[PDB]
Amino acid sequence: MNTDITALEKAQYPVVDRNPAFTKVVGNFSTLDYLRFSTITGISVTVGYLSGIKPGIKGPSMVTGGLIGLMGGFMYAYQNSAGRLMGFFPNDGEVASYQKR
Amino acid sequence: PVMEKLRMFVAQEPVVAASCLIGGVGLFLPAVVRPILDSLEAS
Amino acid sequence: MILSVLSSLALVSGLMVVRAKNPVHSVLFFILVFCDTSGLLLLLGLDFFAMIFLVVYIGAIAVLFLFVVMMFHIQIAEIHEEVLRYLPVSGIIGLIFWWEMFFILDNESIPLLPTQRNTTSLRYTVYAGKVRSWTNLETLGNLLYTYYFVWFLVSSLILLVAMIGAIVLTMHRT
Amino acid sequence: ALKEEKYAARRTILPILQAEEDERFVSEWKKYLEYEADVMKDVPGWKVGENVYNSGRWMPPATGELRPDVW
Amino acid sequence: YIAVPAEILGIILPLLLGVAFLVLAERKVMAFVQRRKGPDVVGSFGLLQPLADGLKLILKEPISPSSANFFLFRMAPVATFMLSLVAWAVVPFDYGMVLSDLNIGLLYLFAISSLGVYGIIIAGRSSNSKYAFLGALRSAAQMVSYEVSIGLILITVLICVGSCNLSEIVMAQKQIWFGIPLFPVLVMFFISCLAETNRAPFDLPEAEAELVAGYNVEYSSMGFALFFLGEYANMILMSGLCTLFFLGGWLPILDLPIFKKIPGSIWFSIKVLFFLFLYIWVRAAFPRYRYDQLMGLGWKVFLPLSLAWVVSVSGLLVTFQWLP
Amino acid sequence: LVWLEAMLPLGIIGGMLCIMGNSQYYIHKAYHGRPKHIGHDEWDVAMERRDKKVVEKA
Amino acid sequence: MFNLFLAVFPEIFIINATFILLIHGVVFSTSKKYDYPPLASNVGWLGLLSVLITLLLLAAGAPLLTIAHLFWNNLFRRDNFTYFCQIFLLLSTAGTISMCFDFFDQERFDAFEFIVLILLSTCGMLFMISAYDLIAMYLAIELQSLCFYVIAASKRKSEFSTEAGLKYLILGAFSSGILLFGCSMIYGSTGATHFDQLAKILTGYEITGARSSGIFMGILFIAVGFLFKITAVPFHMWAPDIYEGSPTPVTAFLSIAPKISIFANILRVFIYGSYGATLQQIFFFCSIASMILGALAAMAQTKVKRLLAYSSIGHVGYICIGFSCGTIEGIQSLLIGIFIYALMTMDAFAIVLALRQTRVKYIADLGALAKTNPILAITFSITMFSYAGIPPLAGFCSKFYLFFAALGCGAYFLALVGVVTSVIGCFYYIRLVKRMFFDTPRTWILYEPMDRNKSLLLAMTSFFITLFLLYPSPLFSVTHQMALSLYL
Amino acid sequence: MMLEFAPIFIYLVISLLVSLILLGVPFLFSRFDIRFYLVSILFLIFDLEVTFFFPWAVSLNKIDLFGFWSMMAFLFILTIGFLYEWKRGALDWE
Amino acid sequence: ASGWGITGNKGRCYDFWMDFSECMSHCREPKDCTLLREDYLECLHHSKEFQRRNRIYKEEQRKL
Amino acid sequence: MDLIKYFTFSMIIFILGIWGILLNRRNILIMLMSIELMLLAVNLNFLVFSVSLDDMMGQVFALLVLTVAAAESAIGLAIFVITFRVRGTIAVEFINSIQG
Amino acid sequence: GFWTFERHNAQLRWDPQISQVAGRRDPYDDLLE
């Protein structure tokens, strides 16, 4: 499969890595990325618990909501980290660990 | 204590468990072993 | 000539689909239209599609229709109607559609009149594309799952909707 | 391997087959050009063997049959 | 093309003789299992019994009951018999011994199997009998249910071969027969064939003592004969398919000059005969499932396992790059 | 040894199958001069038609 | 390889969440341990959460949706226009779902599969907006339509719901076949299905004497399918019956979400394309017919749902006038009208769903509502006057552009039709205010108060309707932005 | 080449003749069960699955890992549907 | 226009389509690409070739 | 003249679907079957055009349309079944309650 | 000439990246490669 990451609208910030790997993007998670992930996971677990009381399945409903929240929170954090590393988002921190390292 | 629930599931639904294991092997080989062989070949 | 034969068989079978008094007979004449279509596809050289029309349209869809329509036990009185009064409106609509639509390719695709000369010696043959021939099956399979896989997965979503809807609308568990 | 062998044998003898086909088609095309020159005699403005393609690139004559290569 | 009908008749007529003698062979084997003799009076060793039975059916008066679907009642056995016959045009018996070397032969066979259900359903509704109709509905549902597992097993063989040509499927087993690494798949295929042929333990149409009337209860004379000949021709065909897909077709057991001496048609016939013996041995060995039980087996056992084997075989082959 | 009675119809079926193969094999070989080729593709067809000219016009 | 799928993170997430909700619902609805609990509201809340998370993922990753555009080019095309259209669609889905919980609880509609089908149709409309090829467009349209057919017959024991499902299925399949025929004709005439290839082949010639009749009829049949989809006359008669017969949440969802998705499709297939004014005349004549028929038929109605259905038909006519004129301001005003009509329709259906707990069926059932719930009667009147187009309410923008385009494009018959239809509409809208405020019936109907979700949504939509024209700049600028993203 | 289909047509003609000879020689001397619809629906779904497997199975050698995983996702969606069928009692004829 | 041929090779009319597309990629007036566009359509439908051959057939029939 | 004849075959199938709609006011099952005929005619056009233009895009869409046709037939027959169950008959006089 | 804009030229940049993919090659490149 021929692949091409070239985006339609060019990055507006220094490109630290144009196609960062999965492990590299994950290792690039900042404290803000872990804050977004934890907030989305906690809100999802809360909604699962509160919506599950009436049917009587608050536990399993918490599990289902937490799974949805874990998926969405990881997705949001990965999005932010990869976009920073590709220069689509403000990434002064990534540029610091690039000039220095 | 989810270690005998799997035991009861295998006892009660042997065909389903066998199907899951067979398909799981079929999915595990290309997801895990194939990248291992690809990485070994390059080096 | 063979196209004329298949066209005539399909025309009569389709008329029978839309005009049979008994709907079961309408489903069986629909199977005859699909067999005729499969023959046409074989003439086109598309054997996979010719076989898949048998497997899916006759083997699965028409069986669904037959199962449902047989268990309905429809009495002729509930669906009968004299259709002589529809000759004029059908005449007008069919004539308009015929003239506008059976000749839609004539201006764009002007036919080659068959001359009284062997124009079959002017067939140039290229052996480069004949060294390794692809079947219609391999040509389709080269594209479905890689370069147009999103449409493939959306079709799967359509099928999942079909399953869920079938259950939610008709299921009465015992 | 057995199939690759067959395909390799097809590739080494392709040029002679293609050359013979090219010669046969050129002779047939000359015959049809002279037939057209005779039939379209006394037709003002005609051009014997005019290319309908503006770019002038050569294409085989179209047959009017949808799938003749499968029969 | 002037010689084509000669080949076609050289296929069809021996097939009809083989069907007539498969019925005799089943009666002889079931009898021998049961400490009896089976047909042994009409001809030496009962060998003229099929001729007598066929001639009897020919002379028997056709009833053609006072139904409102007389054309469909008579056309239903003709449809199923023609379908049973036409599957043999693509079957190879040896290298080059095949009428039509279809490149899409596997899918063609699947299409024929899918078409087989119509004779049974039309017989039920056209017979003007509630008992024949409910039996035909059950039989049709069972056949379509086991078609799914048959198709998924066919896909597994296709992944191993990478071509729908039956001769190529045979010649792909020169290194090893597919029945050795795919033995559970072969067992599933043989059971799915049993259920697809309406054969014991899945023979609902024979369960008259079970208050379950068959789809052909209102048929007499040669309509009934055509249904019977179609079913037995399908049994022979299923044995042939089991042979081709899993037992190397016309290939010898070992690639040695001593085995290569006898013709591949003899190898193919021997393997087909072994599966035809299993069809009868199973009929003689076991009782039959209820309709609900066999439907549960079809949708809950054989489909999941067939899907699992497709996934496992394809994943292993793409992993180690062993694809055709 | 009474069980050989049952091996007669089975042998007859096997012979019928061998006939189904061989009879169509020999009729085709007689009419076409050579046995049927499995895998006749576009290339094999192009060869046969060209060979006809290459033979008849020589 | 993984990073290429950043272009489809929202769809991947929402599809996976829908699968999770399907499994959760089926596993616990069949459970004897929990006494087979109804899960429509539990799954509904989790699905509202999933929709909101999808909206966050889409909104935040605005540049990333255009990543790997060459690789994804033959499947879809994401840009500014699709970005804002999809955000609007997700917001509409979230509001519609939020209005369903009282219906689930008090009616006892316990089917969680209703939520799953709504989520799958939302995935379908997401794919419709980003479709950039006839094949993808058709497939996404069909996924959407199949979900709608199933949910319209969700009350499977009701005569009305089954009838609506049947009429919907038959007429929708008919129109879909017509549209597919159009696509086949276009493909045969041009050898292309991608929208860029179609744009190049068609540009510069339109009807130059030697006109491809195949391309003409392909455009015609595709337009017929689109006009069926937007409930435009004469391909409209399904909509009032289906709207009335479906369950009221289904009607609410159908009156908003599918219009956004198909107008996105219409703008990308034709405006981005190239042909004669023939198609513009098609939409012009359909707009005029829609205004006239909608106005008169709404005047004839005695039931609330049918009145809202015919009102929507009239307003799509008003909207399609903006497509016909073929200017940047035409597209801007079409987008503004769609936005304002969506908000107003959500307001009206929140009121209708609130009153359906007491089984409101007729307009006369609203008698003495100004006495039994004064604030609710005022909120419904603000919505009705917005519908009539009376300034300074938000509904006045549609009227203003209708008349502006007509006196600019040079049309005077259109101005006359607009005047007459506006007056007729004002009459049958203020009839509802007269019923709630002026009548003194012998027998009253006392309505149960609405739940918190519908009250919050109603308060917000009522503030928007009364106050949008005080600060309308963001909508104007974002719609202008979208109109230009289509061309450049 | 479609050349191998002509013998099949002649074979069909001859088989029809034999059937007519066999069947013509002797002429000389109100209950709806939803489970059948449901089994038809499931058969239709899995028949389409077998259909999409044939091009894939013959094409595994060229699509490599990408085609394998796209088919896997297709199967995953359809198997979620099948699990929904199982849990709702569509596979039980009791 | 897609370039995928029905026999596993480049489509018959793909080169004409491309040349048309490169032309339109920098010519601001679409009339600058008319010749290549009608070449692509002629490859698609063979309309002018068949029309000219039908002219030849007509003249032969007239002179017979 | 091959292409025009294939196209007129598809044309007659489409026209027969239109006629089945026109001629079956009291038979909604045949209305559904006429719609299926129209969908087959379009599927054939894509295949014929794909062969005619030497382009594979027609065949991909032909397969996907077959999937759509299957799903639409399944759901349509489900809606038919539930309508029949509620009313006990299929006559069109019992599916006309919504009007105006 | 909106068709000149780079957003409307995706095939012109994508297709050359797959010009060597089996299924869309000129038959002669197989003979000389």
Numbering used by the authors:
A (entry chain f): 1 to 101
B (entry chain b): 2 to 44
C (entry chain J): 1 to 174
D (entry chain Z): 73 to 143
E (entry chain H): 2 to 325
F (entry chain a): 3 to 60
G (entry chain N): 12 to 499
H (entry chain A): 1 to 29, 55 to 119
The authors write:
Protein complexes of the mitochondrial respiratory chain assemble into respiratory supercomplexes. Here we present the high-resolution electron cryo-microscopy structure of the Arabidopsis respiratory supercomplex consisting of complex I and a complex III dimer, with a total of 68 protein subunits and numerous bound cofactors. A complex I-ferredoxin, subunit B14.7 and P9, a newly defined subunit of plant complex I, mediate supercomplex formation. We propose that the main role of the plant supercomplex is to stabilize its components in the membrane.
In the two slightly different conformations of the supercomplex, the angular range is 6–10°. This indicates a slightly flexible arrangement of the two subcomplexes and raises the question whether the supercomplex actively induces membrane curvature or whether it adapts to a locally non-planar lipid bilayer. As seen from the matrix side, the consensus refinement structure as well as the two resolved I + III2 supercomplex conformations include an angle of 65–67° between the complex III dimer and the membrane arm of complex I. The two conformations of the supercomplex-bound form of complex I we describe in our present study are very similar and both correspond to the closed state with respect to the inter-arm angle. This angle ranges from 106° to 108° in the two conformations, and the C1-FDX subunit is present and well defined in both. At the ND6 π-bulge, the hydrogen bond chain of the hydrophilic axis is interrupted. The π-bulge is identical in both our slightly different I + III2 supercomplex conformations, presumably due to the substrate-depleted conditions during sample preparation.
